[PDB]
Design a protein around this ligand. Structure first.
Ligand SMILES: [Cl-]
Ligand SMILES: [Cl-]
Ligand SMILES: [Cl-]
Ligand SMILES: [Zn+2]
Ligand SMILES: [Zn+2]
Length: 229
């Protein structure tokens, strides 16, 4: 499917069954902020990681899925309670899609003027999602690395691929900053970035919220910036 413009979004194929979705927030005076999530074809169903910034943009994701894949969307997982990741929850719910987030994300969501997911994930002491809370996730491997970008940030690996999703936790290997630290846990950030690397040690493609996918150098670089906080 390549790189493709569809509506106001960009879709980029990462692997035979994995695509990155990109949507943009206009901040009047400063132009457009990209946010990336994922689309996974898991057999005869589709799995979404993160919404777009808005309901309309998130409906465009669903329309692209219908046009390009023509398989039903079984579920979505959202990686923390900010607008770039949970802005479009209502569009998923209107389409009848089961939604999942960290229990703490669902507690924070309404306080940040957003809609909670339907289901709450909980995590073992080692950071892996408790399987009873993540029924039928298939290849999606969900990990809580500890607080960093936010207290609630979660991360996802895709079994059967070399791909892991750091979302807003991880920055690219040439980044000059850690991005948006408005809600960050600066004391815990470095260890949480390293914990994400340790959870997905065979990943060679690191997908993140506001940069193109990178090597494992993204993880090291992120942790080293966070060591200076
Ligand atoms: Cl960020
Ligand atoms: Cl791995
Ligand atoms: Cl980024
Ligand atoms: Zn965020
Ligand atoms: Zn971000």
């Amino acid at each position: 499917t390549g790189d493709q413009r569809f509506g106001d979004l960009v879709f980029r194929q990462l692997a035979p069954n994995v695509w990155q979705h990109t949507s943009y927030l206009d901040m009047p005076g400063f132009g457009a902020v990209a946010s990336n999530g994922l689309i996974v074809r898991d057999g005869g169903r589709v799995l979404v990681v993160d919404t777009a910034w808005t309901d309309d943009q998130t409906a465009q994701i669903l329309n692209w899925i219908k046009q390009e894949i023509n398989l039903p969307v079984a579920l979505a997982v959202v990686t923390h309670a900010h607008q770039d990741k949970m802005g479009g929850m209502d569009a998923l719910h209107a389409a009848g899609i089961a939604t999942y987030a960290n229990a703490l994300s669902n507690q924070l969501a309404p306080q940040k003027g957003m809609v909670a997911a339907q289901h709450s994930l909980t995590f073992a002491a080692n950071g892996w999602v408790e399987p009873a809370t993540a029924p039928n996730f298939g290849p999606l491997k969900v990990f809580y690395p500890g607080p960093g970008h936010t207290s609630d940030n979660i991360t996802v690996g895709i079994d059967g691929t070399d791909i892991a999703f750091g979302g807003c936790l991880i920055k690219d290997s040439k980044a000059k900053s850690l991005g948006n630290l408005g809600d960050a846990d600066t004391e815990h950030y470095a260890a949480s970035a390293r914990a994400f690397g340790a959870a997905f040690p065979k990943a060679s493609m690191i997908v993140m919220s506001h940069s193109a996918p990178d090597s494992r150098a993204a993880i090291t670089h992120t942790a080293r910036m966070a060591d200076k906080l």
